[PDB]
Amino acid sequence: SIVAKLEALHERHEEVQALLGDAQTIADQERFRALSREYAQLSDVSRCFTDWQQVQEDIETAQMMLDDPEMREMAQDELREAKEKSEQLEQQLQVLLLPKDPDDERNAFLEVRAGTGGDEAALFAGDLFRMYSRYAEARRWRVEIMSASEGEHGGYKEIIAKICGDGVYGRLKFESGGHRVQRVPATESQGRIHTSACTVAVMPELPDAELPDINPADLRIDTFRSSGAGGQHVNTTDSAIRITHLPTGIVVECQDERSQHKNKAKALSVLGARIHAAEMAKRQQAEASTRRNLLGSGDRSDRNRTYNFPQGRVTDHRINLTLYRLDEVMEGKLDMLIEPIIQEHQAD
RNA sequence: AGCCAGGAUGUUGGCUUAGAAGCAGCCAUCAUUUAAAGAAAGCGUAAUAGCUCACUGGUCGAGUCGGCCUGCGCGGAAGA
RNA sequence: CGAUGUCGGCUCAUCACAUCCUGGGGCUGAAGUAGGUCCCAAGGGUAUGGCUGUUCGCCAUUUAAAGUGGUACGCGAGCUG
RNA sequence: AUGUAAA
RNA sequence: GACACGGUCCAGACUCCUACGGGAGGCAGCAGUGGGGAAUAUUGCACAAUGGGCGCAAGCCUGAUGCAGCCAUGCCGCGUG
């Protein structure tokens, strides 16, 4: 848990403090950033671990020390100090679990898609839109339906939705993946628990900085004679333009009309169109290569979250939580699942 | 104008505690000792340290330093 | 418009330097080699094949280099078409 | 017409 | 008694020497090495015994053999009370 992670951070702090005084390292800036993280973490760690060790010692020694009353009063004072130290350790964990980075402040795109069992997925994906809308209206987030493909017996097959504000992606990072469904559904007559799955993609903003300059100082413009037919004038004059980019290597050849300025206009518009095509193709490949890594095949396999409905259990594969509610979870209030994953993900 | 000197103690200053410390960027751009010193114009350091100028002394000892109005010039001014 | 034959190719070249190489120097973020940039200097040299009629371009391999242009973007009373 | 998978 | 393992010549492939005129070589022997592969051994002792070759015989050679070393590869037996 966090105690096994804090010890490795304290050992890395004690190693970096010894390596800093050895004076054998030329580069020191990354070592100074590591020492800054060490001064942020290991001081509160050495406070909280020593306070918890002294509290556990003063409790376990005075609990069975021949049933004394003065040792019991000393253990009560140590328990008050233990409550103060536990509040200080919770404040230190809340300070260490803070999203300082400005990439966490960005908006997001949620893509809830159906997996196994279409009818079940539709019921489930519509309820997950309901689940994150309930979650989103609690903190006052804006929910806009960008695209929603309907199912058969209700729900939706694919939902792509923008959520805007201040800090959507940094709070909803850990939701890309699969979701189990164990339910007794409304579409099933028999009444046997079934397994259904749904896949959720979480995408960041990535704001469009499009249309770089054409850079006529970087354009190589070759004005040479044209091939073909038509007149004496074509032979005398060039009437053909080839423009090549230096940083991308895009070549556009125009031999269309008589005047070169109509040809100049086409030989710049095709450059702009091919720049826009080659940049939007790379952007759509960068979207797809991340979506195929976040969204799996869609099967019933374990992908980080398992939800149990007839037993009353919510068990995730990372940070094995055992919350037996399923009623304060179905109507917003997803703090207890999301927060400790952040707390022991920012420990690394 | 040259020549023998000075050109300080806290300023590791609070700053985003990784450091910006007279000199990346913030603002404050203090005050003493005072022949004189801007908490700094430049060089050099991860930051220091260090090196000059600002300015003040002394030898020296007669004119010198910087802007403005114009006339004629200089360069930019390279072809078959 | 009572006539100046134009493109590309072969041969033949001439001239300017806004110099591709060779030559002499300055700065460098020039340890040496190999470099980047600037000045003077035209004395000499400044490719071979595939494609395309193509000038040009790409490729393959050399070279110290595969210079830019003018001369009716040279040259048909020198030659094809 | 349809009623996807777990005795 | 071979149209010839440790004989000859010619033609071809591969290593080595050369003073470049030309030559040496053929572990599908025992050992041992590279390569292949999941996979397989020691560059050991001696003719003490047999057998083969030569010699009248004594004697000589024998990586066949008689063994020794390694591998639980297979079988058998014993112990770990």
Place this chain on the structure above:
RNA sequence: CCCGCAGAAGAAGCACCGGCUAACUCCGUGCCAGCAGCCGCGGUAAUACGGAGGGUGCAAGCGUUAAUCGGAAUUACUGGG
């Protein structure tokens, strides 16, 4: 091969445990981690996965893999339709 010295002293592992086929429970996950020669288990009360205990089988060997035959009269001449 025989005698003497000393001290239980130096010498026990491998597979399996639902049926075929020899042997039972507990804990940890939870159609996941995984096992498996076939039927097949694991979906929060697992005699099947992992760990512990116990038992079973074989023994300096034990399991897996690869090949042949039998079972297979499922190549039928013995011995099918």
Place this chain on the structure above:
RNA sequence: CGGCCGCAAGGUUAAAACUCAAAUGAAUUGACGGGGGCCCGCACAAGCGGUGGAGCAUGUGGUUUAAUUCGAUGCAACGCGAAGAACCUUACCUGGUCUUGACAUCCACGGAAGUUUUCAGAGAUGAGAAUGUGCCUUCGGGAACCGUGAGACAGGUGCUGC
């Protein structure tokens, strides 16, 4: 694929790689037939009075909120559990409190139990003042009641009708 035949469509002969522990044949018992025969029920036919159009009462779904407690949710849930929510009931929420406890038992110590009344507080409670001081005497003790301390535990209308 190959060989042969044919004007062609194509026909004849005839594999291999790969996948699975099933495929198929007859037959029994249930299920069903918009298959047949027979029989029954306000099932159809005929009629009566209704619902759905309006207002009110109740319950549910959905929405909102601190909860709008939980279960039932096709016939077989929806004036259902509830044969009756102002507090109580209440299992829900907000706020203030108690933890061997509100309730069951064991040990040690102290005290008749009880009654009246006052102060602060939303009240639980906290802090008091008087009165009463027996049923058997091993009389260091009893048979009940009350308060304190520790462990066994208690408690749960928390989950699972799968």
Place this chain on the structure above:
RNA sequence: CCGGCCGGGAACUCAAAGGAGACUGCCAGUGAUAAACUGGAGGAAGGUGGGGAUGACGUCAAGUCAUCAUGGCCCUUACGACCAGGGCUACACACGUGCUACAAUGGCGCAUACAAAGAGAAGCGACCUCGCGAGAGCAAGCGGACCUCAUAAAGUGCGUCGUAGUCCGGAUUGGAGUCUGCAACUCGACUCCAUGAAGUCGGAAUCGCUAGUAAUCGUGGAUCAGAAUGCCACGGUGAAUAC
């Protein structure tokens, strides 16, 4: 003082027990002279007279561990325990079940006749008085075939209303109130005044019924300090159709 009020009786109504009777008992026809069917006579009741209870092996892995018990899981300075307030009654929408209606076989006012089944003591609460009223003050009888709830209503006579959203219907609202409870504001019931909407017979579609049923009308009880149109139970009038 005609009130079964008092004598007086065990006939009769009512009432409780024990029995009788109704069991295809008999006849005629038909049917295999068998089971059985139809019709007829007696009878109050014809062929299980009528109704209720009594629910076959099994199906729905149908519901309840929230009535209870219980395996195992969990909390055990808490998800356990107590207190005050709020909520379970909130509301842009939809559905289910019932009541009141949309009127003239009907409304209003006066007079008047006929019930069964029940409940009652930290209860029913006569009679008298006051209040338009819900109820209040005083206070018998009864743990009961006597006492109380308790005047039954539709039904009948008479007068009015003339087919209009009107004298139908009664939602909602304001004021003054009454009962209970410690407290009626969220969030009880009832009465008076005043207002008095939608609704003029209902789209697609759908429900129950074959007899004292359908429909209509009233009463009582369980729950309960107070709080039903719901549930249970009783009674009055009472059809039509079944080829």
Place this chain on the structure above:
RNA sequence: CGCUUACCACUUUGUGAUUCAUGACUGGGGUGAAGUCGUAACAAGGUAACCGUAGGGGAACCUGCGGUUGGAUCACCUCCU
């Protein structure tokens, strides 16, 4: 000894057969816990099915011709031997 003829190996040229990998592209085959559309076959499967052949259609498939029951119904017609 040299010469020359006959046999003749390595090698070279020309043209075929067979086989192994590779080859842009294309067709069909087997696998998928979830796909889109249709319901073609199993009851008379709601147009009875199957086979051969020709044509058509996004697709199970449809239509015509020939064969077979590996098909139900035959208390609905009326009258009957």
Place this chain on the structure above:
RNA sequence: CGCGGGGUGGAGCAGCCUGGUAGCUCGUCGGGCUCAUAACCCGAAGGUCGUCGGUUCAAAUCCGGCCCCCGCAACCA
């Protein structure tokens, strides 16, 4: 900016030419039919015709003015 097509339920179209009326398909919501879905049926909402001005008894229409999407914009013998 110059030219044209235009701006009719949430979306397509009639209806403008040639004025006496806001209409029809699709879609949305709700209820039925079925154990449930599809199909089918019923009911409701939805535009004042892109906006404004003028003629007319009457402008969705006839005409004109101002804003918004779309396509074109200097070529060839």
